[PDB]
Each structure stands twice: as C-alpha cells, then as structure tokens.
Design a protein around this ligand. Sequence first.
Ligand code: RET
Length: 229
Amino acid sequence: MNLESLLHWIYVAGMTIGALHFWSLSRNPRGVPQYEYLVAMFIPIWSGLAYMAMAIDQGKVEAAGQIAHYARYIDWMVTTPLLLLSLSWTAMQFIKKDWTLIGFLMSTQIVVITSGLIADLSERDWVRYLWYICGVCAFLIILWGIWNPLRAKTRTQSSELANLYDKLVTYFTVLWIGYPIVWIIGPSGFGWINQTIDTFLFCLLPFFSKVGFSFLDLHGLRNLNDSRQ
Ligand SMILES: *C/C=C(C)/C=C/C=C(C)/C=C/C1=C(C)CCCC1(C)C
C-alpha cells in the first residue's frame, strides 16, 4: 500500500483491469442480458479514465478565489447514478417495458446527484447549505421508495432474487453512509482536513466501493450451487 501523491493514478489502473475482466465474460452472462453488460462498459470504463485526469491536474479549477470540485461531481455522476442503477440492472432478468413506478424512481436519484454538481458550482453560501440538504432529503426518500412498494414484478419474478436483493441494497446503502456522513461533519471529510488529505479519504472510499460492490453484484445473482447434496 502506497501513501504518496499518486492516488488518482493508481485508481484508473485498477479500474482498467476491472472493466476488462467483464469483456472476457461477454462470452455469456447468464442472469443479466446484454444491456446490463453494457452498463459495465458504461460506468466501469468512464469512471476509470476520469480518475486518470485528476492525476494530470485536469479537472478542478479556481472559481471565485476558491477551489471547485467539478471533475469530482461529473465523475460522481456516471459513477454514482449508474452505481445504484447497476445493482438493479444486475438483478434484472429480462425486459419488455419501461414501467412508470420504477421510471419515476430512477428520475429521482438522477435529479439529486445533479444538485451535487451545482452545490460545487454554487453562487452563494446560503444556497450551498440549502442545496446540500436538497440532495440528502430526496435520497432517504429513494431508498425507502424502492423497498416500500415491492410490486409483484419482483415478488413474482423470483423470491430468491428478492431475498439476496434486499441484502444488496443494504450493503450499498452503507456505502452512502460512508460519504453522506463524512460530508456533513468537517469540510468534505472528518474535520480540519486539507485539500490533499481530503481527496485521499475519498480515493480510498470510491475505490473500496466499486471493488466491493463489484464482487457483490455477481456473487448475489449466483455465487455457488449447494442444493443437490
Ligand atoms: C463509487 C462512488 C460513489 C459511491 C459516490 C457516491 C457519492 C455520493 C453518495 C454522494 C452523495 C451526496 C449527498 C448524499 C448529498 C448531495 C451531494 C452528494 C451528491 C455528494
């Protein structure tokens, strides 16, 4: 384990091998249609190149005598918005519609994260704290909105996938607990954190989220067969 100024670099590295492994699995998914595998190329690849930029010093710019984390939000979009969607996509067996219920939900998280970018691209302070609460609020409403209904779509699809799924959304919910909690106290960290040390607490954290949830998504759908004896 290293502890120097090369996090953003080593980050894109691990992400490169990740999205690659999936390419080898394209031979056949078994449990997740093509559109899902594509989801990987979508986020796993995009996220990768993103970090590589943070290393070259091309992402954050000085705006209003301050430091804005623009590159941090955009990457957090395709990464975060498609992170939660990836969990559901991986579970999804087949498709033949759009559905209004789920359709509305997906639009909820989409708007929340959007607020994030603005939070950094704000114009005043009073609006910063105001917007910050705008996201967290709609967030807790989303998670509770997915387990609350529980339409027959899932209850009929496969009880097995419905069970393991519950444990999934739970683990992912913890990932947020990691960021939404450090965000509140201290400046985007634990407290009295600098600009460098700050990006560190994170680099270690989305790196631990993508890697973990990765093996979790696949493990959930199918880990091992232990029925016949
Ligand atoms: C792998 C990358 C991850 C897990 C990124 C996660 C980002 C978040 C959980 C952001 C959460 C936010 C709020 C809860 C309030 C609004 C501002 C955000 C978007 C930073």
